[PDB]
Amino acid sequence: SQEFRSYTGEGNNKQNPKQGSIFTPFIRLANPIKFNKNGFPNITNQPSRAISNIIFDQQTHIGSKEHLTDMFNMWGQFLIHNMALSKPEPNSWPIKVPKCDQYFDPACIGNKTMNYFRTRATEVPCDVGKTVVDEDGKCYEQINSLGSYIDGNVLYGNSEEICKNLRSLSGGEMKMTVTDVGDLPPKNVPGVPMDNDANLFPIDQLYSVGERRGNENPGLLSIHTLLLRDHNRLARKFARLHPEWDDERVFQQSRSCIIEQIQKITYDEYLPTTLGSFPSYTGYDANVNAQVSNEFTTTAFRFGHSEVGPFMEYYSENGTRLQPLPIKFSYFNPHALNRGVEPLIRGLIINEEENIDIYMISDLRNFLFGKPGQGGLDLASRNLQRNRDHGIPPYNSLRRQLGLRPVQTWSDITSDPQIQNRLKNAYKSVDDIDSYVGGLAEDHMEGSCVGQTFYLIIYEQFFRTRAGDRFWYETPEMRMVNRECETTTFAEVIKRTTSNIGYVQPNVFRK
Ligand code: HEM
Ligand SMILES: *[C@@H]1O[C@H](CO)[C@@H](O)[C@H](O)[C@H]1NC(C)=O
Ligand SMILES: *[C@@H]1O[C@H](CO)[C@@H](O)[C@H](O)[C@H]1NC(C)=O
Ligand SMILES: *[C@@H]1O[C@H](CO)[C@@H](O)[C@H](O)[C@H]1NC(C)=O
Ligand SMILES: *[C@@H]1O[C@H](CO)[C@@H](O)[C@H](O)[C@@H]1O
Ligand SMILES: [Ca+2]
Ligand SMILES: [Cl-]
Ligand code: NA
């Protein structure tokens, strides 16, 4: 009776069963400032949408200075969906639109807003860890509505019941939609609630995968598809190798391989690209907590929104460039896979992404439901709100609490005058800068695509989600379990799972 991971994350740490499990408070690297959970946070800086217009506005293409690909940030978005979800409660703190905003209030009605709901929170002890006494006299911490471990929840769901509805229960395989253009994920699966944020298409047309927001964009769904194909491929092998294994055993052995495949790409390919390198595994530490930190998911790792390019490229088998799909048209759009995943994959690995800086494309920052005065969303604003919702300390306060030296003037953050000016325009002091905008404004660390601050927060998180993981693939007991897997590089998984994909570079995150 071999022991396999749970679907929720609990049981991973023997001494602290719930450690890292779903629906548990986030960790803090730095004390939060009072965020007044039950009301609005007391913010003296400019509102989120103002900071968005002043700092994040983008009018031209910059292009990744590190020469990274769209596939790189598709994995980043795929990676975070394995780790953290800040699920909101019906606790409304709307985003105020400045009067006369050309994108959300051209008629100059100064009461226009964008929907925002504060993250689920729970009362915590005031004399434990890094918290703060809220303005109502109690201490609160935000709740991670997802397992903190990299455990394939993106494919298999967050519980037994959801998992056994996504899988065929035959040969240990996952349900799939067989089509004229390869195998695609399933649809209309009972018990698998899928997100429809943009609400362009009816939910019965969305694909049913282990992660609610899997339909967010097609490039994300494509990654889901290939790892599902690779899963059913391994299940057929284990079925032939071990005919005595029932459906449950073939599935788990296949699930175990895919989890290892996800982990290996992250720590052998993704992180060395993000941070320039990464130390080698040093063994499981039962005293390390793998739980996600509030600053990691809220602040540091949200850099990807800066790097998303405006267009999604499509290429055919013979290498011809097809009509690019603009991001704004791809939000929760299953039609993007009508011609299979191969045309997307080709575009993702060849097309260079956007630079990680203060600028965010307008597909994300100025997305509209229709006319310029009725509805829409601003991802830059949502991030600022979330940081202020969670009580992320100011830029210089965070650095101090991370063991870094605080900045003294604007030039200490960057030499680019236009960045300096936009910071002067948005904030009157460096000690008023939001950690999110400050870390983005920093110069990239040597060999990295992020600044010193974000570098430190990201490095600190992924050290723990590896060291604190009892089922980490590099541990002796897990090399034994996964002795018949076929874990390779991401580029080779693509070839294994695609039809006539064409040329694929070894590192699909670069060039
Ligand atoms: C649409 C969105 C994306 C691309 C078209 C996109 C992309 C990324 C990348 C590439 C990331 C990291 C490398 C990344 C990180 C995180 N995102 Fe995320 N993202 C899109 C849309 C959203 C939306 C909407 C949210 C929630 C907005 C809000 O906070 O109100 C979002 C969140 C995050 C996030 C926080 C994780 C969490 O706890 O939910 C990241 C670390 N992304 N995105
Ligand atoms: C808001 O913060 C300012 C200082 O940042 C403080 O003077 C003021 O009293 C605070 N307001 C509330 C309602 O807490
Ligand atoms: C905002 O509230 C309603 C929105 O329907 C609007 O009629 C009203 O004029 C606005 N309030 C102002 C402008 O003070
Ligand atoms: C093959 O290449 C030609 C050349 O432009 C292109 O028009 C056609 O769509 C391609 N068809 C494929 C790859 O099936
Ligand atoms: C915070 O605390 C309770 C414990 O009583 C949790 O069950 C729940 O998540 C709430 O939001
Ligand atoms: Ca950018
Ligand atoms: Cl500098
Ligand atoms: Na997880």
Residue numbers in the entry: 21 to 531
Mind quoting what the paper says about this structure?
DdPoxB belongs to class B of the family of so-called dye-decolorizing peroxidases, whereas DdPoxA is a member of the peroxidase–cyclooxygenase superfamily. Phylogenetic analysis demonstrated that DdPoxA belongs to family 6 of this heme peroxidase superfamily, shares a striking sequence similarity to the mammalian heme peroxidases, and has a signal peptide for secretion. The metalloenzyme is shown to follow the halogenation cycle and to catalyze the efficient two-electron oxidation of iodide and thiocyanate. Its high efficiency in H2O2-dependent iodide and thiocyanate oxidation and its expression at multicellular lifestyle of D. discoideum together with its antibacterial activity suggest that this secreted and highly stable glycoprotein acts in the first line defense of the fruiting bodies containing spores against bacteria.
The protein is composed of 21 α-helices of varying length. However, DdPoxA lacks the covalent ester bond that is formed between the heme and the distal aspartate in LPO, because the corresponding residue in DdPoxA is an isoleucine. The polypeptide chain of DdPoxA contains eight cysteines, six of which are involved in disulfide bridges (Cys-120–Cys-128, Cys-146–Cys-159, and Cys-277–Cys-505). However, in the crystal structure, only one GlcNAc is left on each N-glycosylation site due to the deglycosylation procedure.
